[PDB]
Amino acid sequence: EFKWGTRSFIWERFFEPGLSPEDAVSRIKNTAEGLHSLRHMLETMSWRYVIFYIRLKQAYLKQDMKSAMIMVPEGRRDDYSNAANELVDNMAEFDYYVRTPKVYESYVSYEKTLKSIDNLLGFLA
Amino acid sequence: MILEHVLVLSAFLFSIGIYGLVTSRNLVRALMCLELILNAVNLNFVTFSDFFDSRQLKGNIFSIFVIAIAAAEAAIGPAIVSSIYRNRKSIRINQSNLLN
Amino acid sequence: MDLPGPIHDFLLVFLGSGLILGALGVVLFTNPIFSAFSLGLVLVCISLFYILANSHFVASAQLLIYVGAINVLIIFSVMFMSGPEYDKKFQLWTVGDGVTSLVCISLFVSLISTILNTSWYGIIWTTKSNQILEQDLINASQQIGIHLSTDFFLPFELISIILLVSLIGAIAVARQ
Amino acid sequence: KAFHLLLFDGSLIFPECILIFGLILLLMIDSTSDQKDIPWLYFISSTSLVMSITALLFRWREEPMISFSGNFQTNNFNEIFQFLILLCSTLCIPLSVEYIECTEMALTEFLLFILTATLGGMFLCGANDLITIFVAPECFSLCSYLLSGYTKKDVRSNEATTKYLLMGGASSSILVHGFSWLYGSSGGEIELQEIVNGLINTQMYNSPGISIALIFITVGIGFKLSPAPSHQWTPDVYEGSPTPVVAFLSVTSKVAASASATRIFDIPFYFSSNEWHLLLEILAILSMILGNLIAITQTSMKRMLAYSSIGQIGYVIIGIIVGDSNDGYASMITYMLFYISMNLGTFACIVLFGLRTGTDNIRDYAGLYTKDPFLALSLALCLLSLGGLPPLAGFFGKIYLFWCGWQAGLYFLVLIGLLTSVLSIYYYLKIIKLLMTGRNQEITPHVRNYRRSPLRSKNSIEFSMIVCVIASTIPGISMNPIITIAQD
Amino acid sequence: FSRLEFLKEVYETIWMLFPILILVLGITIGVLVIVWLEREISASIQQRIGPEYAGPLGILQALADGTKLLFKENLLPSRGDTYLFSIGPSIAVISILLGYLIIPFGSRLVLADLSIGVFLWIAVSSIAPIGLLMSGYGSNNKYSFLGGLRAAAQSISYEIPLTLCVLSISLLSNSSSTVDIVEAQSKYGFWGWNLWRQPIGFIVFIISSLAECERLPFDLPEAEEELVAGYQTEYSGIKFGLFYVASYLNLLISSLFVTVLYLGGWNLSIPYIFISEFFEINKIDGVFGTTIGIFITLAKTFLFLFIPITTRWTLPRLRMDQLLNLGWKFLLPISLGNLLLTTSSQLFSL
Amino acid sequence: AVTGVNNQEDLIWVLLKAGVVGFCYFLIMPPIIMNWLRIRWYRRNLLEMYFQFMF
Amino acid sequence: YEYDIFWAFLIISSVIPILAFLFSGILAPISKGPEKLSSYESGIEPMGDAWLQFRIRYYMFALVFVVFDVETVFLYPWAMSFDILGVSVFIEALIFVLILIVGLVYAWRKGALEW
């Protein structure tokens, strides 16, 4: 099965129970892969596609990072949370640099978001 | 984001316009509901051009042409309404059932 | 190139509620004047939706042309109807409206069961190359002008012929 | 710039540019000069409609090409249909100039509307885009709304225009909703041979949103073709409109809509053939059953011809249903070419009879053989060709339509067609039964005071170019198909 | 929900609200100025004094009128419709105020340099006559009905020549943005103004804007001698003040669009002549340069505020049939010819 | 700062220039203008009245 | 962004009449009476409620205005793309302007624009 992204976004947002942590970690991995693939669209200055991708992945991450806290052991659960917050902040900056678009600042926030999500995958394992 | 909700509204408009097309006891109101249906179609076209056609803008051009056609219909009637009111002095369309 | 996320979604919900109110006013008002004024609210909300998506030229064209259309509609509804009739006020309900309400509800349910089941975000990531704008065309109205002038030439003159013939027919039919 | 790219592409629509130039010249002369002359209007309409065919026949051997940046496709299939539209307009101008002149109304506007509907019908025949598959039939439908209510004084024409405008705003907006659904779930593609590829590129060829587009497109097209419960717009409009415009909308509307249906069900919708095949089978079976059954209970000639048209359209639908393999589209034409002559002759006789008589009821057709044997003979020949009687065009057209249906294994469709053709003899024989009544007591005073007058009139030439066709094409049904199987 | 960027976006919303509030305050102040100016110009050309006792020199007269209308009882018609009555003037003032978003008082002293530009101004200015018709229908008065119908007819007649005149200027400047138009004028300096290059469009734009602002001789929907007050007949309290503000705001925005589209805007220089004063004025950059640009824009706006205020108190008013004849038979073909001449002259550029 | 803004002046000099502009605009020039309107109210010609109203 | 200021300005412009109405409601007194609420008819008691029903030949310019609004809307994108392209768009829009002129001439000669 695919476990997500198989119907309209509003139906999965409002009329679905949610994801288990074992699927939330996979959605984290898929979000990281999509962010890695977004580089070519960032270089071609297609701000609408990038902003759609960023909003959708933000809406995924707000649920997935919260529900994947269980898989993180207790010895790291605070630090992971910090990393999660960092990722959110980075994506917020990325948001702020795709709407009201800038090239250099959006690229900087893109690299920061990639590093933050790689740290988040390192914590999730 | 929840952009797909726009599609939902468009569908609603279509159905509402369709409803207003049938229960119309005034042909001016039927013309207005025709405008409603064309507006729902235009909403679908514009949001699809936003979704998939950021460069070519084919949906926006089609929306402009649909607006042109809707205005042409709105020019042809109520001129037809003018002829009907000059000949019959009544607008209620369900009352005219001579051809049956 | 968009508004902030929560602001965008709140604007979507608010303009959708206004559009629903306007359409319901259109299809529930006995007076063509009142329903025309509700249609104007629908037109304004739809133009705001166009501004929301990316259409800054289509919104202005909608406002101009459809505002002319509603002004003409109000004039011809004043001219072709009985007394002002503020007492008409939400025309009565018949069985013939009740059956069509069920039919339209079924049609809307059929449409929304497809809209809610299709992943519209999945199609966007497949049409990547359709969203790479030319870097020289900064102005969106410039792109719409170029693609109206070059891509669509035959409809551009066909609509001119259509408008001329519609004007002639409107003058000939409506003359006393 | 160069004005060249459009100049070389502008020569491809030169037969339509001739119509546009004739339209503009007619309008300018009408505006400039106060006096009005029938012969000049006749000359300009004819020379606009006989120079478009002259240019189109000169463009027959040319290579197929897609011009105006994926907006106009010229090939063998659409050229035949454009020629059919031009033939309908050419044989309907004499039907219109006398009729509108005898109603004491302005005629330059009527000719302008007819020429614009022809121009919007030629563009619909090859319209390789989704915008021009909407704009071109709006160049036709809007003129059809301006027509059929051009009478402007009869209480029937106003109601007919109301019904036509409302029902054709109901359609051609469902059609564009289907166009929006097809354009959205394809990746933003509107060219006809580029959205099946776009559907695979987005992998939405099995999406539930494609079924909505197919149904909406089929409904919006079956309104214009008028088979099945999309037929109710036809009889009232046919009963309450002037006869030349309704003849035009009987022959010109079905040709353009048939071309659009063939080019919209084969090029962009071949992957889902198993759905629109069923839709067209239902749309055709219901059309023949409910167009031949109601026509036998008709007291008005134009309404009976309306039910006749919505019955004969179901025979043509079989040509789309079988497909291009077992002939098929070669049986759409060579029957639509027949159908044009059949309907235009059976409407020219009605035009002359109504003008000399002043009636439309069938009961006033009694005893026309005693008064005008030529008109009765011509009307009887047209009606018998309509019924598929053996030595006339409809019989060979129907056996050509049924040979391909049997060859494709559609036994049910051919059986229903044959049963409805048997039902379709009682009418087209009832009118003749009236025409051969020698009882002076049953003869209405409408035909008792009938003056044929010692002049030819234009409609006589126009239907003598027709009655001699529906009977003497019966040997020439080997010359026509070799021009219609050559297209693909 | 990131509490690093959320505070930044809140402060950004504050920093875009601040220009909106100062512009709104200046807009209401400018309505006060236009009222005072019209009264004093009428007094001067009629050999009177004008407002003298409400303030030092009548400065507080329009403020007194506004506060009186604020304290005046809001009167609603019992026979008519309350909702249309309340909605009409609000729609008119909203659709008139929305045109101030694109007016530049400097190269960057514009709230929003929307690339749609003047087309959006035409689109939003088309909406106010619907509000006037709503006010006429909701008042349930024969004078109000006549005023609303006259307003609709006036707008229908005079929307098209104004649109074509704006289209010709946009064709000349190759862009719909107001800043681009002003800079294209400023390329050649004083001779680069579109006033000299497009005189026919200049006159037609003046007449069409005067008709859309409903100033005399095109004051037919509010003609006091024919109807008692037009669509404002049954309106009392703050709503009449709203329908007064909207009128003066339309006059101000029309004058600003005259000095932007046809005059040079903030530009004041003659590059073809050795004008020391103009060169020294254009040499200033920074805060002082923007201040001088605002001063120049306000002076050029005041010229075409002085002209129509005089026009109201000099000419007689038109008639409805003659208004329609002027709009549809003298202004529209002339604007079409001006557009054709503009295109023919622009063929030399490419 | 951010990409898009270039060669912006220091905030203290912009503040000083805006302060001197506001000082000349809000409390220096309106007194002279209203005195020039009070005095010479009856000595105006068309040009002087036009410039008085412009100021 | 260049359009969030548009939304904020639209919200403020819509809020301003609401503020004016609220201030008038909380400041101005109410003293309603049956004579005061009657419709004003220059002193005399109004007859039947309003309503005029103009003639058609007067209001036939509106059908011209509907078409001409569409034509002037269609002319704008051509003017925006007149410089990027060349004489091709000039030839393209020349037919549009000519059809506009012919329609205006038809409306003039047929008496649609006569009052």
PDB file of C-alpha atoms in Angstrom, chain D residues 128-208:
ATOM      1  CA  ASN D 128      -7.523  20.970 -33.645  1.00  0.00           C
ATOM      2  CA  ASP D 129      -7.580  22.612 -30.183  1.00  0.00           C
ATOM      3  CA  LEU D 130      -9.944  22.826 -27.219  1.00  0.00           C
ATOM      4  CA  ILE D 131     -10.469  26.603 -27.312  1.00  0.00           C
ATOM      5  CA  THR D 132     -11.579  26.595 -30.955  1.00  0.00           C
ATOM      6  CA  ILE D 133     -13.788  23.539 -30.346  1.00  0.00           C
ATOM      7  CA  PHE D 134     -15.583  25.974 -28.021  1.00  0.00           C
ATOM      8  CA  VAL D 135     -15.347  29.280 -29.912  1.00  0.00           C
ATOM      9  CA  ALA D 136     -16.367  27.930 -33.338  1.00  0.00           C
ATOM     10  CA  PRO D 137     -19.651  26.264 -32.211  1.00  0.00           C
ATOM     11  CA  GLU D 138     -20.327  29.504 -30.359  1.00  0.00           C
ATOM     12  CA  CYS D 139     -20.020  31.221 -33.730  1.00  0.00           C
ATOM     13  CA  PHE D 140     -22.768  28.800 -34.819  1.00  0.00           C
ATOM     14  CA  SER D 141     -25.005  28.518 -31.743  1.00  0.00           C
ATOM     15  CA  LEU D 142     -25.202  32.272 -31.143  1.00  0.00           C
ATOM     16  CA  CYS D 143     -26.232  32.820 -34.765  1.00  0.00           C
ATOM     17  CA  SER D 144     -28.761  29.997 -34.394  1.00  0.00           C
ATOM     18  CA  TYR D 145     -30.179  31.893 -31.412  1.00  0.00           C
ATOM     19  CA  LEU D 146     -30.243  35.060 -33.522  1.00  0.00           C
ATOM     20  CA  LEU D 147     -31.937  32.971 -36.194  1.00  0.00           C
ATOM     21  CA  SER D 148     -35.130  30.990 -35.441  1.00  0.00           C
ATOM     22  CA  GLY D 149     -36.386  34.107 -33.635  1.00  0.00           C
ATOM     23  CA  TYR D 150     -35.675  36.491 -36.485  1.00  0.00           C
ATOM     24  CA  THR D 151     -39.439  36.451 -37.091  1.00  0.00           C
ATOM     25  CA  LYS D 152     -39.621  38.642 -33.957  1.00  0.00           C
ATOM     26  CA  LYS D 153     -43.419  38.999 -34.128  1.00  0.00           C
ATOM     27  CA  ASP D 154     -44.959  35.517 -34.086  1.00  0.00           C
ATOM     28  CA  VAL D 155     -45.729  34.297 -30.576  1.00  0.00           C
ATOM     29  CA  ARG D 156     -44.244  30.913 -31.531  1.00  0.00           C
ATOM     30  CA  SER D 157     -40.809  32.246 -32.502  1.00  0.00           C
ATOM     31  CA  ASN D 158     -40.249  34.006 -29.170  1.00  0.00           C
ATOM     32  CA  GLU D 159     -40.963  30.810 -27.232  1.00  0.00           C
ATOM     33  CA  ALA D 160     -38.779  28.811 -29.632  1.00  0.00           C
ATOM     34  CA  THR D 161     -35.910  31.264 -29.099  1.00  0.00           C
ATOM     35  CA  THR D 162     -36.417  31.066 -25.324  1.00  0.00           C
ATOM     36  CA  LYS D 163     -36.248  27.269 -25.385  1.00  0.00           C
ATOM     37  CA  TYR D 164     -33.276  27.207 -27.773  1.00  0.00           C
ATOM     38  CA  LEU D 165     -31.270  29.800 -25.833  1.00  0.00           C
ATOM     39  CA  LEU D 166     -31.930  28.196 -22.447  1.00  0.00           C
ATOM     40  CA  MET D 167     -31.293  24.614 -23.577  1.00  0.00           C
ATOM     41  CA  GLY D 168     -28.179  25.590 -25.542  1.00  0.00           C
ATOM     42  CA  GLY D 169     -26.876  27.507 -22.578  1.00  0.00           C
ATOM     43  CA  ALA D 170     -27.521  24.367 -20.562  1.00  0.00           C
ATOM     44  CA  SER D 171     -25.423  22.566 -23.134  1.00  0.00           C
ATOM     45  CA  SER D 172     -22.181  24.213 -24.310  1.00  0.00           C
ATOM     46  CA  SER D 173     -21.505  24.880 -20.615  1.00  0.00           C
ATOM     47  CA  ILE D 174     -21.663  21.251 -19.553  1.00  0.00           C
ATOM     48  CA  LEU D 175     -19.438  20.761 -22.611  1.00  0.00           C
ATOM     49  CA  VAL D 176     -16.962  23.362 -21.376  1.00  0.00           C
ATOM     50  CA  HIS D 177     -17.087  21.905 -17.858  1.00  0.00           C
ATOM     51  CA  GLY D 178     -16.066  18.616 -19.453  1.00  0.00           C
ATOM     52  CA  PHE D 179     -13.363  20.496 -21.351  1.00  0.00           C
ATOM     53  CA  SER D 180     -12.089  21.935 -18.061  1.00  0.00           C
ATOM     54  CA  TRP D 181     -12.069  18.486 -16.450  1.00  0.00           C
ATOM     55  CA  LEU D 182     -10.234  17.060 -19.471  1.00  0.00           C
ATOM     56  CA  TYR D 183      -7.737  19.952 -19.513  1.00  0.00           C
ATOM     57  CA  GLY D 184      -7.051  19.790 -15.778  1.00  0.00           C
ATOM     58  CA  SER D 185      -6.493  16.058 -15.443  1.00  0.00           C
ATOM     59  CA  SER D 186      -4.117  16.011 -18.420  1.00  0.00           C
ATOM     60  CA  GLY D 187      -1.261  18.379 -17.578  1.00  0.00           C
ATOM     61  CA  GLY D 188      -2.522  21.582 -19.179  1.00  0.00           C
ATOM     62  CA  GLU D 189      -2.897  20.321 -22.757  1.00  0.00           C
ATOM     63  CA  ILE D 190      -5.645  21.431 -25.137  1.00  0.00           C
ATOM     64  CA  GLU D 191      -4.499  20.308 -28.608  1.00  0.00           C
ATOM     65  CA  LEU D 192      -6.520  17.308 -29.768  1.00  0.00           C
ATOM     66  CA  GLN D 193      -3.655  14.902 -30.488  1.00  0.00           C
ATOM     67  CA  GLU D 194      -1.641  15.929 -27.440  1.00  0.00           C
ATOM     68  CA  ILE D 195      -3.797  15.151 -24.369  1.00  0.00           C
ATOM     69  CA  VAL D 196      -3.761  11.354 -24.536  1.00  0.00           C
ATOM     70  CA  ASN D 197       0.007  11.713 -24.235  1.00  0.00           C
ATOM     71  CA  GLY D 198      -0.553  14.287 -21.500  1.00  0.00           C
ATOM     72  CA  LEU D 199      -2.891  11.870 -19.727  1.00  0.00           C
ATOM     73  CA  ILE D 200      -0.198   9.168 -19.687  1.00  0.00           C
ATOM     74  CA  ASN D 201       2.418  11.731 -18.631  1.00  0.00           C
ATOM     75  CA  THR D 202       0.295  12.541 -15.571  1.00  0.00           C
ATOM     76  CA  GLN D 203      -0.859   8.875 -15.365  1.00  0.00           C
ATOM     77  CA  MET D 204      -4.483  10.008 -15.016  1.00  0.00           C
ATOM     78  CA  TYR D 205      -5.875   8.060 -17.988  1.00  0.00           C
ATOM     79  CA  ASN D 206      -7.839   5.860 -15.549  1.00  0.00           C
ATOM     80  CA  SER D 207      -8.815   8.708 -13.217  1.00  0.00           C
ATOM     81  CA  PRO D 208     -12.468   9.147 -12.182  1.00  0.00           C
TER      82      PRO D 208
END
